[PDB]
Write a protein that binds this ligand. Sequence first.
Ligand SMILES: CCCc1cc(C(=O)c2ccc(-c3ccccc3)cc2)ccc1OCCCOc1ccc2c(ccn2CC(=O)O)c1
Ligand SMILES: CCCc1cc(C(=O)c2ccc(-c3ccccc3)cc2)ccc1OCCCOc1ccc2c(ccn2CC(=O)O)c1
Lengths: 271, 271
Amino acid sequence: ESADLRALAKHLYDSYIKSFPLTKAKARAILTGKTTDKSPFVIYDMNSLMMGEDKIKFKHITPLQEQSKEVAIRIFQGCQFRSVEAVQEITEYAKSIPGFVNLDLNDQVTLLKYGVHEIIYTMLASLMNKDGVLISEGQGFMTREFLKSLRKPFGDFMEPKFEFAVKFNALELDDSDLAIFIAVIILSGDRPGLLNVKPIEDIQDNLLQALELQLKLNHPESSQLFAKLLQKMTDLRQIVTEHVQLLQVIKKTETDMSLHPLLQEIYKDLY
Amino acid sequence: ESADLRALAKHLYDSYIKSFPLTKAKARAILTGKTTDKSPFVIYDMNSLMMGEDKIKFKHITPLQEQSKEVAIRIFQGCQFRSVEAVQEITEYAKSIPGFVNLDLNDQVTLLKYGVHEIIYTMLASLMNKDGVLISEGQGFMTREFLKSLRKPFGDFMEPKFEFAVKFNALELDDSDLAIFIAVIILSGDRPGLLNVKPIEDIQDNLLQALELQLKLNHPESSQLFAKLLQKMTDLRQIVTEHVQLLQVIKKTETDMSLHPLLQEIYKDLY
Ligand SMILES: CCCc1cc(C(=O)c2ccc(-c3ccccc3)cc2)ccc1OCCCOc1ccc2c(ccn2CC(=O)O)c1
Ligand SMILES: CCCc1cc(C(=O)c2ccc(-c3ccccc3)cc2)ccc1OCCCOc1ccc2c(ccn2CC(=O)O)c1
């Protein structure tokens, strides 16, 4: 019944809020210039990037590190660090998706391994507009133009995420829609190396029913939004494979070797 | 708060099972023969060492690297290669401790640097009884008396870890307990050169509260187990400092031993 699907949607939204403190709603308030109280520092070129450091450094140092390396490479390592934090946020969220924690632990690991990239881009869209991306928990904003301006291959590496975000954001999903959609992504029975596919597909079936009902209720005037959203997954996956290939080229063709070892530890048979 | 601390303990246990192939439960089942698989080959002397290597017949070459010298040094090399693998597993586990990957990246590095060997020795006890230690994923058993007998400095590497294990194991901790204990060890605010101490202390505080409650629920009859377990941290630290001194001794008494690069990095300017 329908009430239990709403109950599931509400439980997911509650957990999603807990796992991911910078929500889309809060992110969109910051991106407009609404509630004008503490405007984020804008990084729009190399100079402001460096001045941006002594604005999350003048106080103290809690990030990926600071100025003693080429800037394109430091921006890329910053992204890596944040991706590693996001994987843990997603893992925590997964534990609240009904059925997930009762799965074979090996299948949990596999689902997370192949799901996090798709989730990272989905959730990155919430923090983006057409012109840039919120960073450091909404304290900073980095422009798309500056990310795009970074030397090959780093400039063309960033821009696909913005192209996707603009398309994806035009569906106008809110945090309640996204909580269920991320859960659907995670419980994909088609990931390579899964031992027990049937319970995963049974859980995803319940999540798909919950997502369909939420979109029908929340977006009544958006015809076939559910199918349009499922079709977005096809683009997400194509996009992640392109990202994974570009990561290899970068890994191969660059000087700096000091990665975050969640990347190297993951990525087994990721095409 | 109670629910939160039980949730934490469960997360750590799941991550532990994910990161560590040969757990204590599994190890004790092989050691005592409560297992439905295989009985380990026993290495007690030169002649049985030789056959243990040559047990490469219907079970293939074990993952450890290749060798070409006297018995003491061959054993040392096997310890080394396992310790590098152990470091990799511990690092994977560390990333899952809530809050760890959100710390300053230099402090992540420092906590892993000062922390991994204390963890290695804690977890090694799981594979040890008074008579010996399980090796090669539990496919072999190397006797304490054999390891103790190795020519001068090499025997002094070995016997103190067994002395530690007999008493540690007398605490009767299980994997679920150990999962929280090793996270307490890693989140130590006293490591030399930490930049931002308090955010590590705050995490450790919460892990301590979760361990305390774990030991109450799981070992209600074991008086002051929490304290007695915390006091073992003093013994771990002494093992490490004496090990570091023995490594300086072999730099003077042997020819090119030279550690694996990862271990060289860890020991560089260690305490
Ligand atoms: C999830 C991070 C996204 C993301 C995060 C961020 C900073 O926080 C970020 C914050 C600060 C600095 C920064 C660096 C140097 C000096 C001052 C500041 C750099 C970056 C900025 C932009 C961005 O996104 C722009 C394009 C998205 O790019 C991705 C997405 C995933 C990625 C990679 C690189 C590795 N991975 C991991 C992987 O998926 O395998 C790039
Ligand atoms: C953590 C691995 C320890 C550990 C691993 C192991 C085999 O796998 C192991 C497996 C196979 C052979 C083996 C070698 C030659 C022929 C046939 C077999 C030898 C050893 C056996 C016992 C043991 O430990 C018994 C006492 C523990 O003592 C330690 C612990 C870490 C150490 C040192 C010496 C150097 N390191 C490296 C470092 O400092 O990082 C001693």
